[PDB]
Design a protein around this nucleic acid. Structure first.
Ligand code: ZN
Ligand code: ZN
Lengths: 645, 645
RNA sequence: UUUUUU
């Protein structure tokens, strides 16, 4: 749908800055106008109240452009007098997007006075005194609970003359109290306007004289991971190709031999092949296990699927960006078909068809007609292992050759020949190469998020959410490959691509400690390189916070760590560390859930309240907050934590 | 707006109990159908997924009636094939409402097998094993986070035979983990159906042979507080009339003396008069300070404005209910114009006009046309004092005779004749008597709620919310009294009447300890009598929990308590108690907000982190959780806390 | 925001 203007904040003419708001659209009008992208309302003022399906925030007009945050608006069109207006500017790096200001909209003029006395206008038309501190930061004269600032992103910071200094994007909090604000300065809007809206990164970058990082944006099947490195190799270059998937990485061996007559080296956890060829395929995980960049080994490093936001890819790419030049490379290529900000466009091979309530097989509130999947080879994406098992058991009950696939299972359970309805989670994508006659997509994803809940410390929460544009493109892309495909779906939308949660940063530190023998300080250097690099997925900068937390987690019980590592579940280090503190305190775990199985051996001996460090799931036992590590982590919580409102 | 069926949960018809969801309507259709109240979709199944504008939950058909929870549906109609269906049963006491089941709806059969193995069907078609343990309680075999049961209000609990045992209304939580569930049993549906559909409480109750608690539901202006007690008195009875407000109580006295020829006793903080007459007027607050019911003094006690959910009224009515019979009363009358479940209905003398965006005067997102208040006498309700000052300031500066009124101010500032526009908070309700040509209503108000946030204990927060039906009808009733009147409004709905927050219970214990020398045990007795009485406002039963908290708050500093009581702000006991702990620790208060003003003179001596007991506002200072009282309150948080989901 | 008891 489109972003919709549903009100405005009117600013005063002069003398003491004041504001009041007007609501011009209800809920029904917002939903309708969002669906059609056609809004015939007349626009007034320089600050608009805008809304999506589920969220409401602000947009500020400067220099004929209506500006807001990428994290709120994504890549969405704005509903306009003659239909949806396509974004004219999209700067994920700066968390900034802009549409051509509709007629009737007035702009603020960029500030030039250099005043540091600023005034933030909130979505409730409050005018809040702010003292400028940096190019992008200002302190609140009166700290306020972060909830006071909710929905105010996109709102203007004004100088005393009423000129635009920037737009609000996030609150800097101390234990949930906003003491400062982070904003996108006007200078950043200027820079965005005068960058060329069309940068072509569709051709393989040329190897430069001195080190550069370049982007390669090319459609799936265009040969980013095969044709491109083989071309480079032909020119005499040594090339390393990094990819998140073991199945994909192995697959490159055979394909390169027959397609380009190169027998590349192959590096994965499960299998290493050294031929001495000038092209090497590695997973990010194996690259990290190997210690990163070996000096002099490569001229070119291609980070394939560089849009991926799993911790391994992020930490691996950060390692490349920090180490490549010193290891002698001249070119780092960040390769993807779907860079941040990208949206899913129609595909000629793929017919897209909404599911209805007609059909014999219930599926996420809708239904799948049996004739749609009886005969042929089909893939159905579910959000969870349980739903896969269920659906597969049911389809099997109707004599449908159905198999469930997900993490844990071996790919051999999928027959590479003959009819079959595969019911899988996203684990399919990294574990199995191959396409289908149709894809049916629940359009949701299970994701992890951090909450700085202070009860006592933080919580890592798992929730089911609407899929983003990368998820949609990749699930859909399992059909229509050199064949006419069909894509069936529950919902038509897609969340904005190219952002990830702070919890993923937590995962990186965890992996560094657990698998890769990285001190938290070293993990930070790598993640800092990632964060400093334009054109990649973006995340709140909580590096100093997470580093501080892991830095305090000393003398882990090597035995428990071995067990969580082997067991293969999330946060092996944090889980092993809580188990360690428990055992040394001679106390029980937060629960006897499976997450804590490494403790069973001690079950009869462990008693009293849990010295809880943080929340990684439900806590059923009683809790004590007396442990020194709990107190240390609680102390870490007082750090500036920038969060979106 | 109506409740709208937006999907269904289809139950297995044989063998093991299973379920799946069918979604029949999107957000758009929902909003449209809610507004029109007409829904032509065929209805199928026994379990419906239902939504309003803000929330979604379940409804279950039993015995030809579609049942759900009052806390979800309020008194709302259901969208039906020929228009809105009004509720056939509205039982606020049991949190149960029912519509006559539409055509196509099947009904679950009542369970009469006594099976203790139950299955709860969730809004997501999950089937959850539950062990029955009481008439209305069941334990989860696998405790889950409360979030999991979100939106399952109204879902069925089934026995192994697929019969209906009851409907889910709330979770019983241990530190946020649902360990058991509260449900409305089918027996309550049975008793509901077997009591009359209509009842009349419009006439003053006859004095019964033996002690009875009775209800008087009669419109404002009908003489509930004057004509009624006069008539009782004329029959030879001694009457005590209790009312929340001093102004009201003094007003009735003066009136009764001239228009009903008797000089009533009067008991208020500011004015107490003993005339020896048979009728006495008192505030609930003075009645409490008097120690409650005095033996033999009254035949009849009229608890006027018994819908009121302020702590003084609730504790005062609970005291009447615990004490009256033993004190020799013959009759308690619970009198109100707006009992729980009531709604604001169209009023002949009142034309109701929605504000639009056309007007010179900005008002809560809309505007007031200057020609609607330029000549005459009008009343404007704002949610805060600030707004009242600011709107008065603007209006006067536009040539309109505008006056601001709210708590603290002299009532006389209101011209009793001649063109005026009064901008007021709800203080006008008790504080000033008299009509206006029209009322303009912001439709919101300020309320407090508790969050069991465990960070470390609980939080009381103040928020601005949409008004309820009591609020709407009361504000609207200030015009159209005998004459023609106009009611103008920002928004058209109203939240259900007759419910209050657990934070009010907290305030009752606070006032018990601060003002009335009640031990928490004694307060629990009076509150329990209130909660056990049918037909009064309802609240979650957290008496044991709150009693336990206050029981641990011993040896308060009398000086701090004297100051917080005198300053008139909420929770004087909790505030003075946190101050006591800080002062004795030489530690600062949570912040230097005015809430903590009693510590201002000690400021130079206070250092280090606040030993935080609970959160009553923003906490700016660092905190420690080591204090014994903090630890005691943290332990209180382990009690069963029943909460809606 | 209302309301009360000192
Ligand atoms: Zn300026
Ligand atoms: Zn039964």
């Amino acid at each position: 749908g489109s972003v919709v203007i549903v009100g405005r904040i009117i600013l005063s003419g002069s003398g003491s800055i004041t504001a009041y708001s007007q609501q011009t659209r209800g809920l029904l009008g917002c939903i309708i106008t969002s669906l059609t992208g056609r809004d015939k309302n007349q626009v007034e003022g320089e600050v608009q109240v805008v809304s999506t399906a589920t969220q409401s925030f602000l947009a500020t007009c400067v220099n004929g452009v209506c500006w807001t945050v990428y994290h709120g608006a994504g890549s969405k069109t704005l509903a306009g007098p003659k239909g949806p207006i396509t974004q004219m500017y999209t700067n994920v790096d700066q968390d900034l997007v802009g549409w051509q200001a509709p007629p009737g909209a007035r702009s603020l003029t960029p500030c030039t006075c250099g005043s540091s006395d600023l005034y933030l206008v909130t979505r409730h038309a409050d005018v809040i005194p702010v003292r400028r501190r940096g190019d992008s930061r200002g302190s609140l004269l009166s700290p306020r609970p972060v909830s006071y600032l909710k929905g105010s992103s996109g709102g203007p910071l004004l100088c005393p003359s009423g000129h635009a200094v920037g737009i609000f994007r996030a609150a800097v909090c101390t234990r949930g109290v906003a003491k400062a604000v982070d904003f996108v300065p006007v200078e950043s809007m200027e820079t965005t306007m005068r960058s060329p809206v069309f940068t072509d990164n569709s051709s393989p970058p040329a190897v430069p004289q001195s080190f550069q990082v370049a982007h390669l944006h090319a459609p799936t099947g265009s040969g980013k991971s095969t044709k491109v490195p083989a071309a480079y190799a032909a020119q005499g270059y040594k090339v390393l190709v990094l990819n998140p998937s073991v199945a994909a990485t192995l697959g490159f061996g055979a394909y390169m031999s027959k397609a380009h007559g190169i027998d590349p080296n192959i590096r994965t956890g499960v299998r290493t092949i050294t031929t001495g060829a000038p092209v090497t395929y590695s997973t990010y995980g194996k690259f990290l296990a190997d210690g990163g960049c070996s000096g002099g080994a490569y001229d070119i490093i291609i980070c394939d699927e560089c849009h991926s936001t799993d911790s391994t890819t992020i930490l691996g790419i950060g390692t490349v960006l920090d180490q490549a030049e010193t290891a002698g490379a001249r070119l780092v290529v960040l390769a993807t078909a779907t860079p941040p900000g990208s949206v899913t466009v129609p595909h000629p091979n793929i017919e897209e068809v909404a599911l209805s309530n007609t059909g014999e097989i219930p599926f996420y509130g809708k239904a799948i007609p049996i004739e749609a999947i009886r005969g042929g080879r089909h893939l159905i994406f579910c959000h969870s292992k349980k739903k896969c098992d269920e659906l597969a058991a049911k389809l099997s009950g109707l004599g449908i050759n159905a198999v469930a696939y997900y993490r844990g299972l071996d790919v051999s359970v999928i027959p590479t020949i003959g009819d079959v309805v595969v019911v899988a989670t996203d684990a399919l994508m990294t574990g199995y190469t191959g396409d289908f006659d149709s894809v049916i997509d629940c359009n949701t994803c299970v994701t992890q998020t951090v909450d700085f809940s202070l009860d006592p410390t933080f919580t890592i929460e798992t929730t089911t959410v609407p899929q983003d544009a990368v998820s949609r493109s990749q699930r859909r892309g399992r059909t229509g490959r050199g064949r006419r495909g069909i894509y069936r779906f529950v919902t038509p939308g897609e969340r904005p691509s190219g952002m990830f949660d702070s919890s993923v940063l937590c995962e990186c530190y965890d992996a560094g400690c657990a698998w890769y023998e990285l001190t938290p300080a070293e993990t930070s250097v790598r993640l800092r390189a990632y964060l400093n690099t334009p054109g990649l997925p973006v995340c709140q900068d909580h590096l100093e916070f997470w580093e501080s937390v892991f830095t305090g987690l000393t003398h882990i019980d090597a035995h428990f760590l071995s067990q969580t590592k082997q067991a293969g579940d999330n946060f092996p280090y944090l889980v092993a560390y809580q188990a360690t503190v428990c055992a040394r305190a001679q106390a029980p775990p937060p629960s006897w859930d499976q997450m804590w199985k490494c403790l069973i051996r001690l079950k009869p001996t462990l008693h009293g309240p849990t010295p809880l460090l943080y929340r990684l799931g439900a806590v059923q036992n009683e809790v004590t907050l007396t442990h020194p590590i709990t107190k240390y982590i609680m102390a870490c919580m007082s750090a500036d934590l920038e969060v979106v409102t």
